UniProtKB/Swiss-Prot annotation:
Function of the protein: Catalyzes the phosphorylation of (R)-mevalonate (MVA) to (R)-mevalonate 5-phosphate (MVAP). Functions in the mevalonate (MVA) pathway leading to isopentenyl diphosphate (IPP), a key precursor for the biosynthesis of isoprenoid compounds such as archaeal membrane lipids.
Species whose genome carries this gene: Methanocaldococcus jannaschii (strain ATCC 43067 / DSM 2661 / JAL-1 / JCM 10045 / NBRC 100440) (Methanococcus jannaschii)
Cofactor: Mg(2+)
Record note on pH: Optimum pH is 8.0-8.5. Exhibits at least 60% of its optimal activity over a rather broad pH range, from 5 to 7.
A GO term, aspect molecular function: magnesium ion binding
One Gene Ontology cellular component: cytosol
PROSITE patterns cross-referenced by the UniProt entry: GHMP_KINASES_ATP
Assembly notes: Homodimer.
Domain of life according to the entry: Archaea
Coiled-coil regions, chain positions: none
Descriptive protein name: Mevalonate kinase
Thermal dependence of activity, per record: Optimum temperature is 70-75 degrees Celsius. Highly thermostable. Retains 100% of its activity after 24 hours of incubation at 70 degrees Celsius. At 90 and 100 degrees Celsius, the enzyme shows a half-life of 15 and 5 minutes, respectively.
Active site: 160 (proton acceptor)
Length: 317
């Protein structure tokens, strides 16, 4: 495109199976998807970094001498991007000599388990490295993403940043990942999903994890969820994969991390799609639905009468 600025488009992420089990050493299976963020970076030669959150109509201006020394948690909505910048810069051992402006756009819903921040983070790390014509390998990128999440939050997990970085489908176990290709990835490439922001998650992940911590039956149901993953990996048709998703949902309910709203959306996903389940922690948030082409219009209609936001997406890569 004529005169284009540097622009990075990066994926969103969804956990298909093993949401709360991963915390205990079991497997999780996540996939990168079409809902993306876009980060544009260009020069301004005014000697200062300018951040622009177009979707929020917010802006931030910082001098070049302040970045390496800012504390990201002091800048609210700009913290991940700002942190991605500071971290990329000293990793590349660069001391900015010129200013730049960054514009951020995201189609990714916030706080419903999709990895809205990891995406801004990955796109930012890439934008900043590319802007200095010093592209990094997926190796260091995934690591810088991780370290950004760990700096902003007390701890972190590689899931978001690694799935978004390496894309496709990943098997996550103990903060280590195995990429999934072959026949399963192939199958997924033909699937069509619906991300449904059912309701505002009014509780933090730490809190949800605590509540899950206090279940007598937790470990027994985790095994079940893993038994489900075993089956999923060998899967071949949409009907079974669907039922397996529903099954994972029923199990997640058993950990009472679900809500009436989510469950109601899953029922609709079950009757008019092939299957469905909440995704991520469960203080509400969104549901993933496996679309049944033959009934898609019905699905969309029934969902429309519900107080929710709907997003079309497919595995990315």
């Amino acid at each position: 495109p004529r005169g284009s600025h540097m622009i990075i488009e990066t994926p969103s992420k969804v956990i298909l199976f093993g949401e709360h089990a991963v915390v205990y050493g079991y497997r999780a299976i996540s996939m990168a998807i079409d809902l993306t963020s876009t980060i544009e970076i260009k020069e301004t030669q005014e000697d200062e970094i300018i951040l622009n959150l177009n979707d929020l109509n917010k802006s931030l201006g910082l001098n070049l001498n302040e970045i390496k020394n800012i504390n990201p948690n002091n800048f609210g909505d700009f913290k991940y991007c700002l942190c991605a910048i500071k971290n990329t810069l000293d990793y590349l051992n660069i001391e900015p000599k010129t200013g730049f402006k960054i514009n951020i756009s995201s189609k990714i819903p916030i706080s419903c388990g999709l990895g809205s921040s990891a995406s801004i983070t990955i796109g930012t790390i890439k934008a900043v490295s590319g802007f200095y014509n010093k592209e990094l390998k997926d190796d260091e990128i995934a690591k810088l993403g991780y370290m950004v999440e760990k700096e902003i939050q007390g701890k972190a997990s590689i899931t978001d940043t690694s799935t978004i970085t390496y894309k496709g489908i990943l098997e996550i176990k103990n903060n280590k990942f195995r990429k999934i290709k072959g026949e399963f990835e192939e199958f997924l490439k033909n699937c069509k999903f619906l991300i449904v922001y059912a309701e505002k998650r009014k509780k933090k992940t730490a809190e949800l994890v605590n509540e899950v911590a206090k279940i007598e039956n937790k470990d027994e149901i985790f095994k079940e969820i893993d038994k489900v993953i075993d089956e999923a990996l060998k899967i071949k048709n949409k009907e079974d994969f669907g039922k397996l998703m529903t099954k994972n949902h029923e199990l997640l309910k058993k950990l009472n991390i679900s809500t009436p709203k989510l469950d109601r959306i899953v029922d609709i996903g079950n009757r008019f799609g092939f299957g469905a389940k909440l995704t991520g922690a469960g203080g509400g948030g969104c549901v993933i639905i496996l679309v049944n082409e033959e009934k898609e219009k019905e699905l969309l209609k029934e969902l429309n009468k519900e107080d929710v936001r709907i997003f079309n997406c497919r595995m990315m890569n």
